[PDB]
């Protein structure tokens, strides 16, 4: 299974995994995150979590450019997103919000603001990469701690199979050196 909302630990393991392996290994990065694997890590990084993603308020000229471009393009939103660089989701929810803002403006302002558009009807969401970042709770324990523990180990490992195995052969040759030296000492 994959999907659902993004915790903190998944974003932070995602950042940390992006530090060691990241900018296009993402199949490898999914090995650290269960349940959010191949496509969703990449989509979380580029849509929400990238630096320079400009999560601030929409000014005047950005709103001007977005409405100007919506009239110019029709629906082209992935093209519109680079120009306003507020990306695809940010454009679309802002644009739809501005369309609400006009019709609501007098008559909606108290009641239509509140009595329909307040929340989804409990439905499952295809967006969750784009919207949020939930805190890890006061007692996050075993789901997070298992993956936190797997992440720490996999961040540390830094070694190939051969180096890890031949390190044992060094240890085992040292052990054979101690045993075989002592037999030489005592049988001589």
State yes or no: residue 70 binds other proteins (CB under 8 A).
no
Q: Which part of the chain contacts other proteins (CB under 8 A), choosing from 38-46, 65-73, 103-111, 140-148? A: 38-46
Segment near other proteins (CB under 8 A); pick from 31-39, 52-60, 99-107, 140-148: 31-39
Nearest by Cα to 52 from 85, 83, 88, 27? 85
| Residues 6+ away with beta carbon under 8 Å from 85 | 54
Complex with other proteins: residue 2 or 165, whichever CB lies closer: 2
Site for other proteins (CB under 8 A): which residue of 51, 52, 55, 75?
A: 75
Task: Out of 49, 70, 89, 133, point to the residue binding other proteins (CB under 8 A).
Answer: 89
Nearer to other proteins, 138 or 187 (CB): 187
Q: Which is nearer to other proteins, 78 or 152 (CB)?
A: 78
Does 6 contact other proteins by CB under 8 A? no
Contacts of 128 (CB under 8 A, 6+ apart): 3, 4, 5, 6
Q: Work out whether 119 is an interface residue with other proteins (CB under 8 A).
A: no
Q: SS3 of 65, please? A: helix
Alpha-helical regions (H) of 73-140: 77-83, 89-104
Considering only 51-59, 137-145, 156-164, 175-183, which stretch makes contact with other proteins by CB under 8 A?
175-183
Which residue reads 């949020």 in tokens? 132
**Least distance in Å: CB of 17 to other proteins?**
18
Return contacts of 145-150, CB within 8 angstroms, 24+ apart: 147/9, 147/10, 147/13, 147/32, 147/33, 147/34, 148/9, 148/13, 150/32
3-state secondary structure of 169: helix
CB of 130 to other proteins, least distance (A): 9
Smallest distance, other proteins to C-beta of residue 5, A: 16
């Amino acid at each position: 299974i994959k999907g659902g909302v993004w915790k903190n630990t998944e974003d932070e393991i995602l950042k940390a995994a992006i530090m060691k392996y990241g900018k296009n290994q993402w199949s490898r990065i999914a090995s650290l995150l269960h349940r959010k694997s191949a496509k969703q890590c990449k989509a979380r990084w580029f849509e929400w979590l990238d630096p320079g993603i400009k999560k601030t308020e929409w000014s005047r000229e950005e709103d001007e450019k977005l409405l100007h471009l919506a009239k110019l393009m029709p629906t082209q939103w992935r093209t519109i997103a680079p120009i306003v660089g507020r990306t695809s989701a940010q454009c679309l929810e802002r644009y739809e919000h501005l369309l609400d803002e006009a019709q609501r403006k007098a008559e909606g302002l108290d009641e239509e603001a509140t009595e329909t558009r307040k929340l989804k009807p409990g439905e499952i969401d295809p967006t969750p990469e784009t919207k949020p970042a939930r805190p890890d709770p006061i007692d996050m324990d075993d789901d997070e701690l298992e993956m936190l523990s797997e992440a720490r180990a996999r961040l540390a490992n830094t070694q190939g199979k051969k180096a890890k195995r031949k390190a044992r052969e060094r240890q085992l040759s040292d052990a054979r050196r101690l045993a075989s030296l002592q037999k030489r000492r005592e049988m001589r």
